[PDB]
Amino acid sequence: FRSQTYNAEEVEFTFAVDNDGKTINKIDIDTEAYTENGEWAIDFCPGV
Amino acid sequence: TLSISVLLSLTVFLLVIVELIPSTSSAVPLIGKYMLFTMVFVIASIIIT
Amino acid sequence: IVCHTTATSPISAVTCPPGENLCYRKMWCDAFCSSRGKVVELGCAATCPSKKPYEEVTCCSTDKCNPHPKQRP
Numbered sequence A: 001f002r003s004q005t006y007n008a009e010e011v012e013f014t015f016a017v018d019n020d021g022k023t024i025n026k027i028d029i030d031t032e033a034y035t036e037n038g039e040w041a042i043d044f045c046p047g048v
Numbered sequence B: 001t002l003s004i005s006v007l008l009s010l011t012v013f014l015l016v017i018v019e020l021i022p023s024t025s026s027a028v029p030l031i032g033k034y035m036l037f038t039m040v041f042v043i044a045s046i047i048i049t
Numbered sequence C: 001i002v003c004h005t006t007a008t009s010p011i012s013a014v015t016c017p018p019g020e021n022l023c024y025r026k027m028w029c030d031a032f033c034s035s036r037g038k039v040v041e042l043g044c045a046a047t048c049p050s051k052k053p054y055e056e057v058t059c060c061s062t063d064k065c066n067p068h069p070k071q072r073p
């Protein structure tokens, strides 16, 4: 993901902060409502 | 000749079957279980022959 | 016993039906935990309700021991 228009000195990205005060540097999943794919399972999903 | 040609026909029909049955990997389909049963039955019959 | 319940809108304190006494609060996260926090479920049961691997369940017998996280007992 990136901004199509603005450079690093115009728009700057940061990760959202969880309600517990921890940075969510990963793809979030609704573990109670997500359903695994019929062919692939997800192990890790870090963000940088 | 009989057993191996039956096996060949079953393989061709498996090539047919793959067009019809779902390619899901979550669990073995009942039709897939029956197909595997038939294939193993043919193979065992060939061994015994 | 009297426990808070989420069956009614808004949450209200309702006396347990006969046969059940324990208050409980179950909370687990969903896709909207980004800003809204964990889901909240309130009710009464005859025994400490079952817990899913991702769901935290709390059980208490005291009065008003299951309020909403943003409200005091």
Ligand SMILES: *[C@@H]1O[C@H](CO)[C@@H](O[C@@H]2O[C@H](CO)[C@@H](O[C@@H]3O[C@H](CO[C@H]4O[C@H](CO[C@H]5O[C@H](CO)[C@@H](O)[C@H](O)[C@@H]5O)[C@@H](O)[C@H](O[C@H]5O[C@H](CO)[C@@H](O)[C@H](O)[C@@H]5O)[C@@H]4O)[C@@H](O)[C@H](O[C@H]4O[C@H](CO)[C@@H](O)[C@H](O)[C@@H]4O)[C@@H]3O)[C@H](O)[C@H]2NC(C)=O)[C@H](O)[C@H]1NC(C)=O
Pocket: C005, C006, C007, C008, C009, C040, C041, C042, C043
């Ligand atoms: C195929 O899959 C689908 C899903 O994929 C599945 O769908 C489920 O089907 C089952 C039954 O088949 C459903 O279970 C029923 O759900 C009813 C709905 O309950 C919800 O809504 C209630 C809102 O109405 C009241 O509340 C509002 C404000 O709260 C008020 O304004 C209204 O006037 C009204 O009073 C609400 O009460 C209820 O809350 C309960 O549950 C939540 C948990 O989410 C909990 O926090 C609360 O404390 C409370 O317990 C909920 O939000 C429900 O009414 C119905 O109740 C039956 O069982 C209860 C016992 O639990 C009895 O008391 C009652 O008399 C009824 O017999 C029951 O629970 C389920 O909700 C569906 N879920 C989904 C996601 O669709 C299909 O079943 C599947 N198909 C097959 C064939 O299995």
